[PDB]
Design a protein around this nucleic acid. Structure first.
Ligand SMILES: [Mg+2]
Ligand SMILES: [Mg+2]
Ligand SMILES: [Zn+2]
Ligand SMILES: [Zn+2]
Ligand SMILES: [Zn+2]
Ligand SMILES: [Zn+2]
Length: 85
DNA sequence: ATGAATCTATTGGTCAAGG
DNA sequence: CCTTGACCAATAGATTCAT
């Protein structure tokens, strides 16, 4: 069958349906080790990891919580979000 | 001064090929 | 099957643009 039990969307295989269904169940088994990010698809965690460090970018660490960032403006957004005081 | 438009960086949903 | 990753829309914040 490979059809979503929640919205009826049809798929060509079981695994794409499994990933899709997590958007109805809220399940997010893939959790980043370097921040609170969590996701339903393993390659999504891989892509998110680029924001903590990537070839061709430096690493800017948060002076307060030590979290690493490959993009400095993202570290600035992190400062505003988590360490606003 | 204010809001619309438009950038960046990043993420969510989708789809399909590699292992 | 699980893994992988390209692609396109959406999102949040920053900035520019128009008036
Ligand atoms: Mg499919
Ligand atoms: Mg591929
Ligand atoms: Zn569904
Ligand atoms: Zn199936
Ligand atoms: Zn993370
Ligand atoms: Zn921090």
């Amino acid at each position: 069958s490979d059809t979503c039990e929640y919205c009826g969307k049809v798929f060509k295989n079981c695994s794409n349906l499994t990933v899709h269904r997590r958007s109805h169940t809220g399940e997010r088994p893939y959790k980043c080790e370097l921040c609170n990010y969590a996701c339903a698809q393993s390659s999504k965690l891989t892509r998110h990891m680029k924001t903590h460090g990537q070839v061709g970018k430096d690493v800017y660490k948060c002076e307060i919580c030590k979290m690493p960032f490959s993009v400095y403006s993202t570290l600035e957004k992190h400062m505003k979000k988590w360490h606003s005081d």
